[PDB]
Amino acid sequence: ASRILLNNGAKMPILGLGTWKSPPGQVTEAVKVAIDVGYRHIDCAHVYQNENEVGVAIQEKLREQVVKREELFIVSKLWCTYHEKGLVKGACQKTLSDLKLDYLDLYLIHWPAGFKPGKEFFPLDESGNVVPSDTNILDTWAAMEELVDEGLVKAIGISNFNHLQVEMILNKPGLKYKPAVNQIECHPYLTQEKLIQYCQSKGIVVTAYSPLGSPDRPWAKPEDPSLLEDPRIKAIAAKHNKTTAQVLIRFPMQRNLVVIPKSVTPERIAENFKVFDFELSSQDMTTLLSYNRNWRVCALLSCTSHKDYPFH
Numbered sequence: 001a002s003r004i005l006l007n008n009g010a011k012m013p014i015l016g017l018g019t020w021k022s023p024p025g026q027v028t029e030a031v032k033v034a035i036d037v038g039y040r041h042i043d044c045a046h047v048y049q050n051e052n053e054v055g056v057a058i059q060e061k062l063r064e065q066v067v068k069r070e071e072l073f074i075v076s077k078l079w080c081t082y083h084e085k086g087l088v089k090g091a092c093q094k095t096l097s098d099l100k101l102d103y104l105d106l107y108l109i110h111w112p113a114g115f116k117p118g119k120e121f122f123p124l125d126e127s128g129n130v131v132p133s134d135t136n137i138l139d140t141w142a143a144m145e146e147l148v149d150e151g152l153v154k155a156i157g158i159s160n161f162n163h164l165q166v167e168m169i170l171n172k173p174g175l176k177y178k179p180a181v182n183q184i185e186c187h188p189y190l191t192q193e194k195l196i197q198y199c200q201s202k203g204i205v206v207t208a209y210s211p212l213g214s215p216d217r218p219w220a221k222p223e224d225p226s227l228l229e230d231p232r233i234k235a236i237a238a239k240h241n242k243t244t245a246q247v248l249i250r251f252p253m254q255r256n257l258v259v260i261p262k263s264v265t266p267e268r269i270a271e272n273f274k275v276f277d278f279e280l281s282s283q284d285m286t287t288l289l290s291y292n293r294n295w296r297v298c299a300l301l302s303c304t305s306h307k308d309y310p311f312h
């Protein structure tokens, strides 16, 4: 089953293409190839600085009639410096303009924390701490709801929200639209059982980011754990005549998660999509879950004192 039903009534492809770190001179081809080989979901963000180039690909494939717009599921995210009532619509509109779209399928609050507006994505004080905004996650959520009512987005959701932050949203006085998705880091070294069960219990679909462990993250260190090189995961892959990446992508799929592996390599884009013709056993699944080490690749010291930093 290639799509999962969201609490807004729309269906979301369980496999998408990630675009963080995809170079602007490679991402247009990456997205073109992805659509040609079957991808229907692209995960984007304004902070990734490549939405224009992603958009060139989407638009060309729509113009070529490779795909219809209704068949695509395009996701983007509101950056931290736009949490303000008066900035949310324009931030969404910039993303739409760049992506060459008239609506998004899903728009996420990228991180729960708001930062001081301005040119800089991470405004810092003189001692290196991020400069917060005073706007909370409830007022930012109201601004997201307006986007649904204005036709700019079909669904809204959240990303990197912890259990208490999700609960805050769900308990919002006058809540109009529930979050459809919570997009969080998830892989065998950070299995997220507690947060996933909470979200799923509330009808919120979870998307797993960095499912391969983000080996290209800029802050990687040579001796960090490596999922793709873990011999235990290689052994499960060999047993199934699949690659390690294919196992790492199928794993979240069988947990009823959406998953968004990134690649700019055409052969790997195609490889990564060939995950609908095999099944991990229950024993395989439990074995992969057993590798949890609470190892989080996406975290940021400069933001750890923000009142809404999620990983405290």
Ligand SMILES: NC(=O)c1ccc[n+]([C@@H]2O[C@H](COP(=O)([O-])OP(=O)(O)OC[C@H]3O[C@@H](n4cnc5c(N)ncnc54)[C@H](OP(=O)(O)O)[C@@H]3O)[C@@H](O)[C@H]2O)c1
Residues within 6 Å of the ligand: 017, 018, 019, 020, 021, 043, 044, 110, 159, 160, 183, 184, 208, 209, 210, 211, 212, 213, 214, 215, 216, 217, 228, 243, 245, 246, 260, 261, 262, 263, 264, 265, 268, 269, 271, 272, 298
């Ligand atoms: N919401 C958030 O805060 C948040 C945070 C992090 C990530 N995300 C989203 O999640 C996406 C995926 O996470 P990620 O980019 O951190 O990392 P990832 O998807 O876990 O790993 C990407 C890395 O794996 C490599 N790779 C891909 N397929 C491979 C294969 N078959 N064999 C070997 N290596 C392979 C890629 O290399 P090449 O590209 O060189 O092929 C790239 O270096 C992001 O791009 C972004 O869209 C969201």
Ligand SMILES: O=C(O)COc1cc(F)ccc1C(=S)NCc1ccc(Br)cc1F
Residues within 6 Å of the ligand: 020, 045, 047, 048, 049, 080, 111, 112, 113, 298, 299, 300, 303, 306, 309
């Ligand atoms: O964020 C992504 O999608 C992928 O990561 C990034 C992608 C970018 F284009 C720029 C920075 C990040 C960083 S550094 N993200 C971590 C991060 C940001 C904000 C807060 Br609150 C906490 C935190 F941990």
Ligand SMILES: [Br-]
Residues within 6 Å of the ligand: 111, 112, 113, 303, 306, 308, 309, 310
């Ligand atoms: Br945050």
